């Protein structure tokens with residue numbers, strides 16, 4: 001168990017020293033990517049059956 | 057004290073509390089507070105447009121093509137069927153050696169198919185073969201556990217997930233594990249490649265998800281929070297977020313750059329486990345497959361449920377959205393696939 | 398008066414309960430395809446349809462004629478009595494089938510999963526319904542049962558339609574359920590051997606409870622009417638029209654109870670719960 | 675068009691019914707228990723390899739042995755929640771890994787995903803057990819002192835010429851596994867013990883009989899009879 005403890009500490013030290021951003025910015029980018037493509041998602045806004053290959 | 061093992065346990069817990077502090081530093085708001093002013097997507101009522109039959113047992117995997125037209129399906133009858141979703145016709149029906157297949161992938165060129173299972177072997181078949189019938193082309197051996205998922209990078213790179221709690225990047229021709237990713241305690245169940253092939257995440261039975269750097273072979277982030285084993289995972293179409301579903305009847309959305317959980321999707325009336333997850337084309341909609349024969353549609357921004365998909369007669373084992381967002385497919389334990397839009 | 402209006406309201410409640418239970422069964426089947434998925438469920442649907450016909454067609458007119466005392470639809474009632482003979486006979490018939498079904502699934506489980514294809518299920522349902530319609534309509538429209546609406550059939554028709562419609566199904570059902578009892582007693586004894594060995598009556602009482610409930614409700618509900626239907630035209634010791642009418646109502650009462658005794662599996666319970674909420 | 679639809683739906687209906695009619699049996703048990711030898715023998719005498727497909731009396735079976743080699747074989751086993759029965763094989767002649775086998779059996783019998791899967795217990799390698807019993811060199815009481823106070827059951831049906839020591843040994847192992855199997859209870863699943871050796875040939879009639887019993891008891895508890 002001596003090797004796995006050195007490996008657990010070194011992995012946690014590598015994962016610990018990351019720089020994190022604010023949740024506000026993560027949500028603002030998600031909202032921007034959402035509304036930037038919202039009008040093009042057929043599953044959200046149903047597209048008329050004419051351009052639907054399974055309805056025409 | 058003095059024994060470096062107990063001191064490593066102490067520095068470990070110290071690091072977990074430094075991580076909790078580094079998480080609360082960026083934990084300034086909640087997703088609900090940010091998205092309280094958005095409008096709900098409204099009622100979304102998709103209907104079954106096709107039903108693809110032929111399979112003799114419960115289906116376990118499906119994968120759209122890049123053309124959003126072809127897809128591969130795996131049943132426990134020893135078959136790997138390729139479907140033309142427009143006409144519901146089968147283009148090929150490849151019998152497999154081991155009938156307990158658990159995953160299948162589709163090369164972005166449409167040139168190769170993959171599959172694997174309890175044989176701990178990933179078999180690649182060239183669909184663009186030049187004579188007779190599609191047959192085995194390559195076969196990647198080396199895992200001491202069952203292959204649960206595999207995905208192509210290109211026609212010669214594929215990443216696999218196995219029951220030896222490790223992931224590996226392979227050179228299909230040479231059959232060598234070009235890169236090994238270790239660190240999970242339990243069985244790694246699912247992987248999802250980033251839209252730029254550069255990264256991928258994996259969910260294991262140690263109630264943890266891990267983000268792996270493809271080119272460097274190191275684990276970048278480890279996320280926890282689920283009380284059970286994580287069974288499914290998928291990237292947000294943007295590439296900076298992903299969702300997980302677990303046996304504890306809960307879905308959780310994590311962000312990579314913030315290094316903590318962002319949102320939890322659950323209802324006190326949903327008690328069955330969860331088998332598959334997938335984002336919409338814009339990532340605004342999150343689809344999750346439950347054992348209760350239903351598909352729950354969550355609003356990936358407000359955590360509110362926006363729709364249900366009651367169209368299968370048995371447990372939904374898998375699902376997948378087209379890459380163009382034109383339709384969604386669902387594979388279930390009724391030996392049927394259903395397209396919804 | 399008080400008795401007349403009370404009989405009226407109770408009978409209307411009986412009819413409404415029959416309709417609700419059986420329409421709930423047919424709807425719970427049609428709405429949920431995972432209940433319609435198996436094959437044994439087909440026969441239960443047949444039973445529900447038989448009881449729904451009893452309800453909508455036969456019962457209310459007899460209740461009105463019992464209240465008012467006179468048959469108002471007139472030339473109709475020939476048909477009515479035919480319908481009566483038919484529906485109250487597809488019901489008993491259907492029970493027989495369901496019982497035999499269960500037997501095939503317990504005395505030879507392997508042969509069952511192989512041989513019972515939905516084609517054989519439809520053949521059995523067809524046998525039930527065609528025996529009913531044949532033996533019912535044909536002698537009415539041909540006026541063979543005849544030598545306010547006169548329901549007195551005839552001495553030979555009584556015995557004939559009775560032997561068929563009741564005494565063959567009750568024989569088959571008693572034989573079948575007693576065979577199932579022998580088998581269940583065997584399996585309990587085996588499990589008891591193993592469990593007593595490991596650790597080194599109640600479940601038998603449970604078997605008795607369920608078999609007695611099933612077979613005993615059917616018999617104690619239909620049998621008196623049919624021993625009367627046997628003796629009365631013969632004895633034209635004897636009884637009166639009112640008693641014959643209440644024992645008739647017992648017969649149609651089985652038609653009310655059938656859903657609760659044949660369609661309360663746990664999944665059936667949850668389907669009802671998710672329909673009504 | 676119409677006749678293509680007719681030929682397809684009826685061939686696919688017969689194949690769907692056939693797969694529905696094949697009884698999958700999962701083989702589980704420690705290694706050094708002759709599991710692979712039993713599957714190899716079935717492949718030989720009726721028709722080793724990871725898989726086996728064999729028919730008894732027009733009844734199809736599919737026997738599978740999983741070689742994933744781990745402890746919580748959840749996903750590798752919870753994908754096989756619909757098998758008719760689990761054949762648990764145990765090397766009765768390995769006196770010290772028997773507690774390991776018992777613990778694994780306890781974890782299987784109380785598994786959350788097998789609450790309804792009945793298990794057929796094969797106590798394999800009885801000939802080696804008789805050899806060890808006649809040798810009298812490694813006694814079970816040294817590992818399980820309870821065997822000292824154990825009494826041969828009065829319901830035992832020994833084969834002609836069986837040493838009471840051997841009878842007591844094999845029925846002791848039987849009751850050691852039955853003590854685990856009878857706790858859980860709940861009537862959702864049962865254990866069917868069998869004394870077997872690798873050369874026994876009726877080891878198909880036993881699996882047939884007991885799959886039939888499992889189906890009988892499922893049909894009984896379905897109609898609330900049992």
Ligand SMILES: Nc1nc2c(ncn2[C@@H]2O[C@H](COP(=O)(O)OP(=O)(O)OP(=O)(O)O)[C@@H](O)[C@H]2O)c(=O)[nH]1
Pocket residue numbers: 704705706707708709710711798799800801802870871872873
């Ligand atoms: N004398 C005797 N030997 C047996 C019997 N059954 C199995 N063996 C031996 O025990 C060994 C262990 O069996 P294996 O073939 O390894 O099967 P297993 O150990 O249960 O599982 P694997 O190791 O994966 O094959 C075999 O090599 C057989 O030679 C038996 O009934 N009698």
Ligand SMILES: NCCc1ccc(O)c(O)c1
Pocket residue numbers: 481482483485486550554555557558559560562626645648
């Ligand atoms: N409700 C009684 C209808 C009926 C049905 C069958 C018979 O044999 C019979 O004599 C009378």
